Design a protein around this ligand. Structure first.
Ligand SMILES: Nc1ncnc2c1ncn2[C@@H]1O[C@H](COP(=O)(O)OP(=O)(O)OP(=O)(O)O)[C@@H](O)[C@H]1O
Ligand SMILES: Nc1ncnc2c1ncn2[C@@H]1O[C@H](COP(=O)(O)OP(=O)(O)OP(=O)(O)O)[C@@H](O)[C@H]1O
Ligand SMILES: [Mg+2]
Ligand SMILES: [Mg+2]
Lengths: 51, 343, 343
């Protein structure tokens, strides 16, 4: 979850739209979102930032 | 005195040009329109639309800026108690690059200008797309549908509650394809102004007259204000134009004050009585005079930066049609009373 | 001296050809049109459009190049310290492959041309899709919709505040559908030019007169400049044409200067008095003369590379049609006064 938040930070810094696929492209195991709190953390980080 | 300060003669030509550009004349027409518009804004009382008709160069935009400034000044004392409350927000309609006016872009830009006081306040609109960024500017994703943007704008407008919503160049709302009724695009704004409760002031030229009276609902919730030019038939308007010209001549930053009232016919001919056009003409002539470092204004110098006869004829034709459409006489009142059966 | 340097005679034909190509002559019409254009650019004063009508071959493009160069030279002392500013940005309208003018491509190419000052200058467009690639070039995603590109261009133009947005070959704006009004295209350009506050200069041939005086708002914010040709019906233009022929004949890089003044009727016949056409004709004739290594220029050489009578009879008809609508007489002034009641 911590790397998920950090990756969404880094992706939103450059202005590119942070989506699930784009974040997955920057993970060693782009399948961790099947856990139902990694996705929750990603959604919370996006919604705090305004998506 | 009543003229420009004499210290400006030693200042560079740029300073004199800036001073003349910033100068504003309080001629009777602008004053009266200002009082009527601010009285309407102070209390709309059911009306949702304000139509400020006028020619090109009468001074509609400067009137809007003056009204915005004075509204902000009046809301400054009350802003200390109730925060997150925009006093006035104003945008300009965009002439579309396609055959239809883009409502999505209108909503996006209205949201951008309205919801940018500063970063200290957050509202958390009900739609996911709209958000701020690291630069402090609102960016709206292209995937946000138009009804969602409309709902977000409605929520933001309800929260902020500006006194009036200015829409400059409202004649661009008439850019529709064949078979599309102009009434529908007016109800599109009327519904927003009704479910939101924010007065909308539409400023535009005589092309805005196509939105004058489209339905009974749109005629009830509308205030009609005519920014009128100066005519040559009535001696009072001629005297007002001469007074404005004399005031302009006193406030022209030149070493020797030019004589400018005597050539009042030539000015009215190429200006059509609009103070904005005359101000632009005098600004151009003053810039040329300072470019050569002249000491006065000569008739040929005015002849240089004068609008062509064809341009003036076109503007006068549209002014004639607009004034004919907007003329109210006792015959119309009597016909209305006879139709109402009030004899 | 008054002619080409005598050292060029020993140089290869390429050097002489390039010297003739790069040579320019300041005839009275060009100097007058340049002074008018620069005075209008310096102080638009409520003008958002500058139409420069002229025949095909009068020198509109070289006038634009000269104005851009002189503006850049003026801004260079200020650009030494101040940065993030472009003095002048120039674009050329594109004739569409389809029936309708492509506004999406106009915004894309305007954004590309305007925003290439330096890789260091980074500014946020506020729209996702436009950025700079690995080659330091502006790339716009094909999924970016035209209103978004318009908003990005508006933000860039406001940020960079160029003095004038030149739009050459502006007659290509008229490539619109039969059901599309030409006033709407001008309104779309005027809206950008007004929210951006950037003066727009439209250069084109007499086909651009279809964009002349479409409304009172597009007439007041318009400064029509006519790049008039030389006419044989008045001795003054004939003398000017003879003088320009004299300086051209004395600046031709040849061992023996050809006598061009005697055959001035022939040169006017195939050029209609325009300077660019005569310059290109002389350039061609000199190229053929130097290919054969001719000591001078013969009439037959001029006939070899001249324009056919069928070619000239169409350009001359277009010039007549354009000059008919660009002529102002005292009768028009009296009609305007009578309409305004100023008699
Ligand atoms: N009362 C005034 N006193 C001084 N300057 C004025 C006045 N009214 C307008 N101007 C000048 O006119 C210019 C702005 O144009 P103006 O506000 O008259 O146009 P508008 O009629 O509202 O707009 P549009 O022509 O697009 O419909 C500015 O240079 C401004 O200084
Ligand atoms: N005053 C001038 N002195 C010298 N050469 C000139 C002058 N005006 C134009 N030319 C030359 O004429 C040629 C073409 O003219 P130019 O491109 O300026 O015309 P234009 O008005 O833009 O034409 P068009 O509308 O047909 O595209 C060029 O080789 C240019 O150098
Ligand atoms: Mg305005
Ligand atoms: Mg050209």
């Amino acid at each position: 979850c911590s790397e998920v938040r950090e990756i969404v930070l880094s992706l939103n810094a450059q202005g590119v739209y942070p989506t699930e696929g784009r974040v997955c492209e920057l993970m060693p195991n782009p399948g961790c979102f099947r856990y139902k709190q990694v996705r929750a953390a990603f959604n919370d980080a996006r919604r705090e930032f305004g998506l | 005195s009543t003229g420009f300060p004499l210290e400006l003669l030693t200042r560079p030509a740029t300073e004199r040009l800036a001073y003349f550009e910033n100068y504003t004349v309080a001629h009777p027409r602008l004053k009266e329109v200002y009082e009527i518009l601010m009285r309407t804004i102070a209390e709309p009382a059911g009306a949702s639309f304000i139509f400020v008709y006028g020619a090109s160069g009468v001074g509609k935009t400067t009137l809007r800026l003056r009204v915005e400034q004075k509204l902000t000044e009046l809301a400054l004392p009350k802003l200390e108690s109730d925060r997150a409350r925009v006093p006035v927000v104003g945008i300009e309609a965009i002439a579309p690059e396609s055959r239809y006016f883009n409502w999505k872009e209108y909503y996006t830009r209205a949201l951008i200008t309205l919801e940018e006081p500063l970063i200290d306040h957050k509202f958390d609109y009900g739609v996911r797309g709209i958000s701020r960024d690291n630069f402090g500017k609102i960016n709206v994703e292209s995937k946000v549908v138009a009804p969602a943007l409309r709902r977000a704008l409605e929520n933001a407008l309800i929260h902020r509650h500006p006194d009036v919503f200015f829409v400059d160049e409202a004649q661009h709302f008439g850019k529709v394809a064949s078979g599309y009724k102009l009434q529908d695009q007016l109800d599109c704004l009327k519904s927003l102004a009704n479910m939101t409760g924010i007065l909308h002031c539409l400023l535009g030229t005589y092309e805005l007259l196509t939105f004058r009276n489209l339905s009974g609902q749109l005629s009830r919730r509308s205030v009609d204000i005519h920014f009128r030019r100066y005519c040559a038939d009535s001696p009072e308007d001629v005297q007002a134009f001469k007074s404005v010209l004399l005031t302009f001549q006193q406030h022209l930053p030149l070493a020797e004050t030019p004589n400018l009232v005597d050539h009042w016919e030539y000015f009215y001919e190429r200006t059509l009585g609009c103070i904005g056009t005359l101000k632009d003409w005098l600004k151009r002539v003053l810039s040329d005079a300072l470019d050569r470092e002249a000491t006065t204004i000569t008739l040929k110098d005015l002849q240089k930066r004068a609008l062509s006869v064809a341009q003036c004829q076109k503007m006068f034709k549209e002014i004639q049609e607009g004034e004919r459409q907007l003329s109210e006489t006792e015959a119309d009142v009597q016909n209305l009373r006879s139709a109402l059966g009030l004899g």
